Design a protein around this nucleic acid. Structure first.
Ligand SMILES: [Mg+2]
Ligand SMILES: [Mg+2]
Ligand SMILES: [Mg+2]
Ligand SMILES: [Mg+2]
Ligand SMILES: [Mg+2]
Ligand SMILES: [Mg+2]
Ligand SMILES: [Mg+2]
Ligand SMILES: [Mg+2]
Ligand SMILES: [Mg+2]
Ligand SMILES: [Mg+2]
Ligand SMILES: [Mg+2]
Ligand SMILES: [Mg+2]
Ligand SMILES: [Mg+2]
Ligand SMILES: [Mg+2]
Ligand SMILES: [Mg+2]
Ligand SMILES: [Mg+2]
Ligand SMILES: [Mg+2]
Ligand SMILES: [Mg+2]
Ligand SMILES: [Mg+2]
Lengths: 539, 77, 49, 138, 200, 328, 132, 194, 101
RNA sequence: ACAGGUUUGG
RNA sequence: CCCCGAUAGACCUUACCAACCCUUGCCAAUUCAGCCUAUAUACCGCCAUCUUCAGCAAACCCUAAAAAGGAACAAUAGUAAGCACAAUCAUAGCACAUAAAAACGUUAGGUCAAGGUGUAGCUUAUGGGUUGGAAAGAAAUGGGCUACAUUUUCUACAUAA
């Protein structure tokens, strides 16, 4: 979807999120221009006459006939409500078919107006109950007024008209969301509604068993027993459950898994039983299923199961199973969280170059797990290769991530084979901050040990003198190390300035620095300077 | 692709003698209309309805102009 | 349809998507001419008035 | 290393209707330059040798259309400007093809057909006899 | 009539007539003025006559965490934006009006005695930093050719000297003034005298 | 630009590796023979100039070369004529003049000792060796050469050749000689085939002014021609057209010794005769010896007639006829 | 003297591109066609229907990308979908480039009743072939 | 703020599958091609232009998606849609004895918005008269009834129908013409006695 | 707008010819024949003459699309001989090149 | 006078 | 320059004229359109000419000073990127020929009438539509076709009647 030109290739996740919106803002703008000026696109040249490339019209066909204006205004909020008044002003009798769609057009978009239109459903004409609950029950759940919804069920039961699937798909939620120090009465009412749904010769659909399951996740942590009972009862019917059904069960198991590690095995076996067949996203609630089935693996440290979760998603459709990228960025990050340190460094590096630059950029979390993986196995040749990518992928998080990317060099040794990378990684960091960026004092201890074994003292001495002018002085262990380096390199003129710039700021190890300078001057035959420094620090 | 021509066949295009029943058979009207029928059958550009409309235009024109055919000396209906 | 061409181009230019350099040149030249003092007379006052 | 799994899912059914047979499938490819035509010939030969088509390829003669216009704007007729339009042809002669084979071959060819060339397909549809001609007596 | 329009470059080339057949030998020079004003200088791509704020050109793409819809300004701020555009049009000439001044050698409007800096280093690598140069004469020399008629060429006299007795002079003649100065500075080092100075 | 040249070498190497990978051939056996064809196939750029087509060769071939180092680190020039402008051309002139003086003194000593054991190797008529041209000398000597200097060098070479040359002097003079590009303009003779119990079988092809003719001749039968199934006398009523057929046969005395069948397409009454004549002449070479083939190709029997009709020009009548140009 | 599609010789400082540096007698010899389709063949039709749409797009893209378009367009016509290759300078932000490409792919497709592809290549400056 | 991102060349693997980078027709974006290609007429002292920003490299069609590797990879999966050709009909002698009728149908392709080509309506029907059951007088009558459409030297009748708009309608008209000719070749009317 | 008032009038001429093409096509069948008597042909002549003037395709002039030049315009490209050169020498038309033989 | 401007295609 | 714009005129073409009609009068809109009105001595775009003539030229060097010039081949201060020439390309094999190309400039050369145009002029008209005519030859002249015959004319016909 992005353009392959380097100036247009997205660098970070925010840029990738912004470029798509920018392109869509031009697409919908051109569509709006087409809709505003259809006469410039009426001419058809293509022989197959592709209708999707034709301009759309948002105006009705007839404005005088009320029955013709209602059917055009129900499909194209305020105009649909004004058409109702324009129809009722002429004393026109409206049937039970146009009123149903007129009420649905309002129940789809849209408190007082809701009641004013709901009274227009019964007071004007006896609208059919089969069209009454398809509107009012679904319109009151978003207005948070379920006390009137339960009366419509009694009304339709007294009118001897059966209740459809969409009735119970919302009434159980409406009666479950109302709880006042009681959780048993609502469950018993749900059971008594199911025993009547099975009595009224209406088979419960997949969403019927899914909606009751969606309500048992926010009320009780022990409510997984009925969640599994209905899951087995639905298997006993012969309807293969979609991903949305298992999503809520895995969500409840993830809530009950933090205190007890037993639900993880149930999650794993049910996921292994589900992953044996190719599914299809026939339910719009199949997005968080993977977000939970991989979050459990990332929380309980199961890479052998993270591999199975990754192999399950790309079985039938690698892309039609996740809707938003907010879940993808959290999904691949928590996958690489386990993949960095659990498996081999070779596997980590081979899965890095395929998912990080191509699929999605990591967050600030997995960037620390990468440092941990490169530190546990003592891998130094990959640090300059990962940092050059981090320069572009974590520039927004660099100021809160740099204090942990450079500590890996001091914990390991300094072989004489990587002395050029040891200098490049320090230069590309330090030469950019002095031209603007809080500079941590621990980076100077690293730039000292990178050049100590490298044998470059002239370039290392300037970095020590540059930071001392930043109104901040590092610890005297760095001074004692650079003093050993200077006394090994036979340059006594450099220590007489270090001791002076440390004594005026009163380092806590100044009494040891004064002992080390004496030994250095005795070794290099500078007792005159050894006494001159004492005579200078005295005053 | 995308053009079915109203699901017509060759018998609706070539064989058009079925529309010349409202004309004198032994008069010059048939001699004139056979040429129009051949031209319409040898025209892959027009559909069947347009040829029917041409035939009907000729029918109503000849049926409206009745004085000229009676004046010409040849009896036509 | 040259009328469709011109209307589409002018509508885009006025909406802020197309930038017609020739129309901008015509407008700049007309602005300079009216600033110099020789513009287009009003309809009905050219011959009589 | 991360290769997608279960990527094969076609919808191929066997209908009981006898497939149509073809004797000769002629493909006349017209273009402007010869390099594109040679690349297309190599591509077609490579696509036909895998399917077992035994394509016979020969180069039909070229056709050049030349036209003369004036050189100046108002009045200069002794001086002219002549423009030329070349058309090089390639003949792909396929023999012993079936209905499904011809369909898949023409699909794989017209999906990757270049922009600067055109292609004319002439099919020799095989048929034995209609029903009113086998042995009728008026 | 949209196909009848052309490029602004061709429009200006046909309007100013810089390549006219009369301006070759010198039959022009009557209306001695030539200015081509860029129309797209301060023309923002997003703004239009109707004032539609596109989420990608005029207004940002994201506000308050949510996307921005297609909106249009009222008829009270677009007029002020156009007034600011007219202000910038009338200020354009003020921006491109400045002559970089320098120190005067002899008079305020001459090059005699003005400083020009040390000459360029030699090809072998020697650098003349202690040398100081001065322009002594500037003259616009004309030559009558066969086609171009008057061929204005700048010839200047440039002297070099360090202050220890070694100095010289040279003449640089070219088409451009900056090129003539450079040629004179580069040729003045090759001709150096030594002046015997009693007690320096 | 040594760093640029090295970077281009590395880029060419990695691009050749990736090209072999994407083509599917072995990279070790992948060379320029495959590079050229792979590039021509992957980038089908049909142009009239091959140099304008995409080409990926070695950087040492893409970027041109120049003169090598003339002086070492000390700055002293290597050659002893570096301050002459042409350290190669003037060195060649000096060496040629030195060899000329040596040959002159050798010949003088031989004349004084009364010994004439040399010969004149200047008459190069049967060899067809011509002297070098300006391009043939500038391709050897890297630096440019002037026309007057080239003429002086050629005249010095001919001066040296006009004197009795020595043993290595002959090679020294001949190393700046270029003979005919192939020196073998003699044509090839088609072998005598035998098709379906038919001996003395031969076939020939001819063309003159858009008229293509093929002849099948049998050297065992009597003398007659079969022109498109009909007799030659009825096919060519004019005497000229029959003389065109008799001309190749009369020169070889094969009037009543060959039976021929000719098929001609295109042309008129004389173009067909000329094409059949050319085809017969090219076909009768298999029955005669080499000297008679040479005599025929010297007489013009084996050479085509490039005189075709020229295209008409704008503003003219017959590509030469101009309109009436009025002076006033 | 021929003037058609021929830029004259200046004093020696003007930058010219590979296309303008070649006289019109070099078409199909050293430089190729800027547009590829089938209407310009021998036994094919629709030569003007594609030519008018070519000129309209030549003007449309020039008006859409002002000042940032380096060279002319490359207009390929292949199987009912037309490709527009452009060499643009990286003057505009990537968000403004994506806005315009998404607006074009949805405007021109509906205006010509055929799928359009728009490919952009960002160059730092105009690539100079001859003297500059 | 200007950002310069390196192209894919520095990340291209030497063993990477090229059809994965170029599966379909592309405008030859130089950012995904690790091959340094120089196209264009060089200068007297210069070299052909580089691949970056080369207009001539975008002018020419690219076959990078049709490398032999991709050709084989695509043709391997196409073995499932095709059928087997009957080996008992390799020689045309038996093909003529089994299916004597030949049906020539023209089909054309062109890039653009229009698909309708008036040259596609023609349908040719070639029938060998030596494979039918006409008697002597029936054949002698069919010859004079078809006229010049029957080649006496080749013994083939050619019927070129273009009267119907649709190709299927022309095919039906051609088979009707063959049927009505085979039927009328046998009817001996009153005028055949003279 | 259009290119010129001449082109604007020619567009209306083509539109009226397409509008009344069927009527003239049906009436000319009554005049171009010799079987029907001339008595009705003389009336059909007056009837077809009573039609508007711009209804006959004879008034249609093949002008250019870009500049609407009345002469020197090719029928295949519908472009003037000068605009065609201005585009071909630019290279916006495939296959067009300078004829060299 | 420590001088500068002013003739001419120059 | 003179079968030139025009590879094309009964209406349209056609910008000419006479009779009559309309004046925000092609576009969404514009105290706005529209002009085949003048200026080709303001232009671009396109060309004619010398012209199958080769010269042009940034960067250096030289002159008993330099405005400028820079050459003697048995050579006396000349090197040089690129543009011209050349080579190459096309007339499906070479060579040839043809084609193509021919910079910088002269003719204030031709084109405001292919198209857009700066300046100067029209808006109940130099603008937009309908109908009818746009002859004719006292005379001169350019370029082509037919011939003024016997190597001709007619007949069938490849050329022996
Ligand atoms: Mg002053
Ligand atoms: Mg106009
Ligand atoms: Mg004087
Ligand atoms: Mg003439
Ligand atoms: Mg008229
Ligand atoms: Mg008129
Ligand atoms: Mg007028
Ligand atoms: Mg002029
Ligand atoms: Mg020369
Ligand atoms: Mg000089
Ligand atoms: Mg040079
Ligand atoms: Mg040349
Ligand atoms: Mg050749
Ligand atoms: Mg030659
Ligand atoms: Mg020429
Ligand atoms: Mg003049
Ligand atoms: Mg003149
Ligand atoms: Mg005028
Ligand atoms: Mg104009």
């Amino acid at each position: 979807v992005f353009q392959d030109d380097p100036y247009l290739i997205p660098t970070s996740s925010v840029e990738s999120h912004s470029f798509l919106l920018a392109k869509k803002s031009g697409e919908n703008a051109a569509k709006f221009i087409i809709n505003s000026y259809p006469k410039y696109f009426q001419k058809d040249i293509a022989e197959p006459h592709i209708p999707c490339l034709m301009p759309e019209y948002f105006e009705p066909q007839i404005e005088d006939v009320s029955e013709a204006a209602l059917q055009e205004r129900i499909k194209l909020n305020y105009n649909f409500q004004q058409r109702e008044q324009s129809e009722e002003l002429e004393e026109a009798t409206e049937a039970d078919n146009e009123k149903s769609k007129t009420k649905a057009g309002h129940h789809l978009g849209v408190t007082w107006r809701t009641k004013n239109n709901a009274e227009r459903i019964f007071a004007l004409m006896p609208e059919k109950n089969a069209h009454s609950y398809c509107t009012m029950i679904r319109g009151m759940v978003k207005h948070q007024a379920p006390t009137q919804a339960l009366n419509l069920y009694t009304v339709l039961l007294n009118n001897r008209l059966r209740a459809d699937v969409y009735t119970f798909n919302s009434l159980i939620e409406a009666t479950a969301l109302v709880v006042n120090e009681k959780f048993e009465e609502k469950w018993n009412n749900i059971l008594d509604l199911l025993k009547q749904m099975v009595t009224q010769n209406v088979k419960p659909n997949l969403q019927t068993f899914n909606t009751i399951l969606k309500c048992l996740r926010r009320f009780y942590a022990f409510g997984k027993l009925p969640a599994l009972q209905t899951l087995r009862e639905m298997k006993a019917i012969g309807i293969e459950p979609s991903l949305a059904t298992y999503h809520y069960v895995i969500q409840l198991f993830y809530q009950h898994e933090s205190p007890s590690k037993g639900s993880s095995l149930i999650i794993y076996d049910i996921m292994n039983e589900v992953m044996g067949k190719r599914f299809s996203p026939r339910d719009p609630d199949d997005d968080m299923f993977f977000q939970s089935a991989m979050r459990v693996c990332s929380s309980l440290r199961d890479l052998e199961l993270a591999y199975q979760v990754h192999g399950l998603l790309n079985t039938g459709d690698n892309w039609k199973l996740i809707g938003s990228d907010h879940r993808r960025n959290f999904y691949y990050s928590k996958f690489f969280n386990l993949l960095c340190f659990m498996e081999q460094i070779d596997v980590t590096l081979k899965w890095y170059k395929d998912l990080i630059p191509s699929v999605f950029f990591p967050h600030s979390q997995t960037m620390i797990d990468l440092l941990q993986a490169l530190d546990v196995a003592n891998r130094l040749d990959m640090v300059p290769q990962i940092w050059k990518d981090s320069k572009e992928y974590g520039h927004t998080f660099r100021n809160e991530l740099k204090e942990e990317i450079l500590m890996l060099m001091a914990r390991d040794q300094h072989p004489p084979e990587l002395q050029v990378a040891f200098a490049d990684c320090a230069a590309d960091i330090k030469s950019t901050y002095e031209s603007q960026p809080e500079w941590p004092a621990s980076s100077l201890n690293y730039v000292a040990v990178l050049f100590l074994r490298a044998g470059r003292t002239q370039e290392a001495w300037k970095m020590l003198g540059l930071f001392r002018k930043h109104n901040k002085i590092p610890r005297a262990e760095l001074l004692n190390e650079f003093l050993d380096s200077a006394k090994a390199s036979s340059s006594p003129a450099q220590a007489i300035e270090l001791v002076k710039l440390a004594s005026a700021f009163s380092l806590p190890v100044c009494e040891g620095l004064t002992r080390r300078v004496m030994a250095e001057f005795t070794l290099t035959q500078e007792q005159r300077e050894a006494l001159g420094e004492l005579t200078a620090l005295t005053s | 692709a995308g053009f079915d021509d109203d699901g017509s066949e060759f018998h609706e295009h070539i064989f058009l003698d079925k529309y010349l029943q409202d004309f004198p058979k032994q008069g010059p009207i048939r001699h004139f209309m056979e040429l129009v029928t051949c031209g319409l059958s040898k025209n892959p550009y027009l559909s069947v309805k347009q040829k029917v409309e041409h035939i009907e235009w000729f029918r109503n024109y000849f049926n409206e102009k009745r004085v000229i055919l009676k004046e010409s000396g040849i009896q036509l209906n | 349809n040259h009328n469709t061409y011109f209307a589409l181009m002018g509508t885009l230019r006025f909406l802020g998507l197309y930038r017609d350099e020739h129309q901008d040149f015509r407008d700049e030249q007309l602005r300079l001419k009216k600033l110099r003092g020789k513009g287009k007379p009003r309809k009905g006052e050219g011959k009589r008035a | 290393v991360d290769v997608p799994k279960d990527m094969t899912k076609p919808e191929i059914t066997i209908s009981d209707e006898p497939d149509t047979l073809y004797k000769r499938l002629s493909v006349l490819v017209k273009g402007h330059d010869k390099a594109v035509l040679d690349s297309y010939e190599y591509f077609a030969v490579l696509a036909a040798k895998e399917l077992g088509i035994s394509i016979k390829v020969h180069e039909p003669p070229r056709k050049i259309e030349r036209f003369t216009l004036l050189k100046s704007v108002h009045i200069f007729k002794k001086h002219r400007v002549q423009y030329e339009m070349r058309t090089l042809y390639r003949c792909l002669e396929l023999e012993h093809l079936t209905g499904s084979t011809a369909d898949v071959y023409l699909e794989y060819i017209q999906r990757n057909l270049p922009e600067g060339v055109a292609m004319e397909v002439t099919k020799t549809k095989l048929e034995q006899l209609p029903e009113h001609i086998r042995k009728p007596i008026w | 009539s949209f196909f009848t329009k052309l490029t602004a470059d061709e429009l200006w080339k046909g309007a100013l007539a810089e390549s006219g057949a009369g301006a070759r030998k010198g039959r022009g020079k009557r209306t001695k003025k030539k200015r081509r004003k860029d129309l797209n200088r301060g023309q923002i791509i997003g703004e239009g006559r109707h004032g539609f704020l596109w989420p990608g050109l005029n207004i940002p793409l994201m506000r308050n965490g949510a996307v921005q819809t297609i909106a249009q300004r009222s008829k009270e701020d677009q007029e002020k934006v156009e007034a600011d555009m007219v202000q910038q049009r009338e200020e354009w000439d003020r921006r491109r009006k400045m002559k970089v001044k320098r120190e005067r050698g002899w008079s305020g409007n001459t090059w005699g005695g003005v400083s020009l800096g040390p000459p360029d280093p030699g090809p072998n690598g020697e650098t003349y930093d202690d040398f100081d140069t001065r322009i002594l004469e500037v003259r616009n020399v004309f030559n009558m050719t066969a086609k171009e008629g008057r061929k204005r060429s700048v010839r200047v006299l440039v002297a070099v000297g360090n202050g220890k007795g070694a100095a010289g002079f040279a003449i640089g003649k070219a088409t451009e003034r900056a090129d003539a100065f450079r040629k004179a500075k580069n040729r003045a080092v090759h001709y150096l005298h030594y002046i015997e100075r009693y007690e320096d | 630009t040594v760093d640029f040249i090295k970077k281009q070498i590395e880029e060419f190497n990695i691009g050749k590796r990736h090209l072999a990978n994407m083509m599917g051939e072995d990279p070790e056996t992948f060379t320029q023979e495959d590079i050229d064809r792979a590039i021509a196939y992957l980038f089908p750029s049909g142009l009239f100039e091959k140099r304008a087509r995409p080409i990926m060769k070695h950087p040492e071939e893409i970027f041109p070369k120049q003169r090598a180092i003339q002086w070492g680190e000390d700055g002293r020039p290597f050659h002893f004529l570096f301050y002459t402008g042409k350290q190669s051309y003037y060195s060649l002139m000096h060496d040629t003049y030195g060899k000329l003086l040596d040959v002159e003194k050798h010949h003088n000593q031989l004349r004084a000792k009364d010994l004439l054991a040399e010969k004149t190797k200047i008459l190069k008529d049967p060899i067809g060796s011509r002297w070098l041209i300006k391009e043939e000398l500038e391709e050897m000597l890297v630096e440019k050469l002037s026309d007057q200097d080239y003429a002086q060098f050629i005249r010095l070479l001919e001066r040296l050749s006009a004197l009795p040359c020595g043993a290595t002097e002959e090679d020294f003079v001949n190393r700046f000689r270029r003979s005919i590009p192939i020196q073998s303009k003699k044509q090839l003779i088609e072998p005598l085939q035998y098709d379906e119990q038919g001996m003395a079988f031969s076939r020939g092809e001819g063309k003159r002014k858009t008229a293509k003719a093929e002849v099948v001749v049998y050297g065992q039968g009597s003398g007659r021609i079969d022109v498109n199934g009909v007799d030659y006398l009825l096919y060519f009523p004019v005497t000229q057209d029959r003389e065109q057929l008799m001309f190749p046969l009369h020169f070889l005395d094969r009037l009543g010794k060959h039976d021929m069948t000719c098929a001609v397409s295109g042309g008129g009454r004389s173009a067909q005769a000329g094409a059949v004549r050319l085809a017969m002449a090219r076909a009768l070479c298999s029955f005669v010896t080499e000297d008679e083939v040479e005599w025929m190709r010297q007489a013009g029997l084996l050479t085509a007639d490039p005189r075709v009709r020229e295209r008409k020009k704008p503003g003219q009548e017959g590509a030469r006829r101009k309109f009436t140009w009025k002076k006033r | 003297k021929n003037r058609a599609a021929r830029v004259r010789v200046s004093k020696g400082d003007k930058p010219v591109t590979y296309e303008e540096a070649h006289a019109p007698h070099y078409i199909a010899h050293r430089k190729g066609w800027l547009s590829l389709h089938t209407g310009n063949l021998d036994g094919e039709d629709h030569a003007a229907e594609r030519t008018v749409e070519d000129v309209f797009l030549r003007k449309f893209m020039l008006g859409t990308f002002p000042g940032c378009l380096a060279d002319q367009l490359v207009l390929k016509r292949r199987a009912n979908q037309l490709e527009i290759c452009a060499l643009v300078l990286r003057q505009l932000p990537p968000h403004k480039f994506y806005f315009l490409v998404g607006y074009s792919e949805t405007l021109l497709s509906h205006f010509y009743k055929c799928p359009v592809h728009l490919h952009l290549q960002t160059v730092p400056s105009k690539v100079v072939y001859k003297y500059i | 703020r200007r950002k310069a991102l390196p192209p894919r060349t520095e990340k291209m693997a030497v063993d990477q599958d090229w059809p994965s980078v170029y599966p379909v027709a592309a405008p030859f974006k130089p950012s995904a091609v690790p091959l340094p290609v120089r196209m264009g007429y060089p200068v007297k002292r210069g070299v052909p232009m580089a691949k970056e920003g080369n207009l001539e490299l975008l002018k020419i069609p690219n076959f990078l998606h049709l490398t032999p590797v991709a050709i084989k990879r695509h043709c391997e999966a196409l073995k499932d849609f095709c059928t087997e050709w009957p080996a008992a009909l390799d020689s045309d002698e038996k093909c003529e004895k089994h299916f004597p009728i030949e049906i020539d149908t023209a089909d054309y392709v062109s890039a653009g918005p229009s698909i309708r080509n008036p040259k596609a309506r023609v349908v040719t029907l070639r029938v060998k008269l030596s494979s039918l059951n006409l008697d002597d007088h029936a054949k002698k009558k069919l010859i004079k009834l078809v006229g010049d459409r029957y080649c006496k030297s080749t013994d083939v009748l050619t019927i070129k129908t273009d009267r119907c708009p649709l190709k299927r309608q022309n095919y039906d008209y051609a088979v009707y013409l063959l049927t009505v000719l085979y039927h009328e070749s046998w009817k001996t009317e009153e005028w055949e006695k003279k | 707008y259009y290119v010129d008032w001449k082109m604007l009038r020619d567009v209306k001429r083509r539109k009226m010819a397409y509008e009344y093409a069927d009527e003239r096509l049906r009436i000319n069948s009554l005049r171009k024949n010799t079987i029907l008597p001339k008595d009705l042909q003389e009336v059909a002549d007056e009837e077809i003459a009573s039609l508007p003037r711009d209804s006959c395709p004879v008034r249609i002039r093949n002008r250019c699309v870009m500049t609407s030049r009345p002469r020197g315009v090719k029928r295949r490209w519908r472009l003037s001989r000068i605009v065609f050169r201005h585009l071909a020498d630019h290279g916006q038309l495939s296959g067009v090149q300078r004829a060299m033989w």
